[PDB]
Design a protein around this ligand. Sequence first.
Ligand SMILES: [Zn+2]
Ligand SMILES: [Zn+2]
Ligand SMILES: [Zn+2]
Ligand SMILES: [Zn+2]
Lengths: 276, 276
Amino acid sequence: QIPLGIYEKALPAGECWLERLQLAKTLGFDFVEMSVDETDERLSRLDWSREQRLALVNAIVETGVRVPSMCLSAHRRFPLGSEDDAVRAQGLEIMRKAIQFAQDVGIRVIQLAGYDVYYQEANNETRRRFRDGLKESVEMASRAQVTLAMEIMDYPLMNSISKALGYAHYLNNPWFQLYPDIGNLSAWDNDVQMELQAGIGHIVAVHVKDTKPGVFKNVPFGEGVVDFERCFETLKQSGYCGPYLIEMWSETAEDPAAEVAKARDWVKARMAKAGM
Amino acid sequence: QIPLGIYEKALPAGECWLERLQLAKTLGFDFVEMSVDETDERLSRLDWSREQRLALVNAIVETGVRVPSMCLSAHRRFPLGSEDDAVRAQGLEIMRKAIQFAQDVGIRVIQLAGYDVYYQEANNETRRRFRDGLKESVEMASRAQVTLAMEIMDYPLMNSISKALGYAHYLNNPWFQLYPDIGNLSAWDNDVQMELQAGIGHIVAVHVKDTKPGVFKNVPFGEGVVDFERCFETLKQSGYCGPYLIEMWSETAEDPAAEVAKARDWVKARMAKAGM
Ligand SMILES: [Zn+2]
Ligand SMILES: [Zn+2]
Ligand SMILES: [Zn+2]
Ligand SMILES: [Zn+2]
């Protein structure tokens, strides 16, 4: 049966994980994806004590709701391509800490953000520094035996499965894999269905959200350009058996749980249509 | 860093995992590989309670000594190729329970036994049943996001990297990888150094021991046909950045602790001559 998860930032903001995990179970999800983003509050998770780490493991084992993956979007703030050597070193230290964290709490996959730089302008130097930082991250990941899976991004350097496969070929490492976002993939000039089929033996997780050209965030399900039934059809037929994660940001909604319930039923209807 | 690890059965027996991990720490090992073999005793680990599983996580985090991998030799007794449907079901159940155990406890890689059958003679039907059992196993691993790694075996069906690569290509799944034993890879008529280069983007871990033509188990370090310095050179030059696990049964043989320290330094000496 198909594992279905919810993004952390879809649910109420608390740092009590047992409550967060119990809520996910109640809403019918098998898992939660943790965000380690640009904010200092989530960034501080990497400096958690042994007891804070073991408390998360406790809540997981007790509720049965897994935290198999981490979204590492902190690299938008501290990119690995930064020609500011201080910022780049901060980005690699965050990579090191996310992997140790992953080891500590049994996170299966760290989703990488494919930005060479975000708030600054890319050039050849940012692309070379990003590539080297990726090799270095993947080396750390080989030692720890932790999967780093590159997201297909809201950003041209990594805006297709083909571009992620380029990096995968260059790296040639079993611990570097693919985590496509079917929304991000659908908002450029890609052949989406061929891209999905092309990545198959590299795809470890799928992000599920709607988008429009140039709009990658908070676009409501059904109001964008993503052909969900087609994407699930292709993935199923091509032999994909991994998890799907509903990505939304309803932490700011009046009733986060009610929004998540509606999004879950909407996504599930389309999975069912496509044979799953 | 080269992560160096020690097989469970190279250390004194029992179920206090805290003491064992502590022992491996003072001996200078980064990690311990757990065994889930043919004994009811070790199989009952798959039936541990949430509390037993948590106590193991606690000890790992306390000591800093990881348990990143599991040797799953239990399939010799309950093979996936068995023409006895009841024996086959048991092996599949074991596979399922091992994946969940790996989830609960944060094990990175489950090392699979590459035998269609072991105590019976193989035929087209056992090969077929083993093939479909593997596929079922890999689908379970994809949902859970747990790596299953095929060991290079003391058995003709999987006696090279090439054989494991054949299965890897057939399965075309990121959760099926490769776990070469350089002893077993050397105990046949293989081109060893070619094999290790061939498998490189699939190799997640490496078993280190010594063997002879025909003889597979416990030949002391240096007395077999394994060219350690050359194997370590091939892997170093090819871009391997993963762990090495020293396979020993010291738990029997004289002063177990003093034997693993000799073999630890013997392995490290061979690695250092190879550029490492
Ligand atoms: Zn490929
Ligand atoms: Zn996404
Ligand atoms: Zn291959
Ligand atoms: Zn071995």
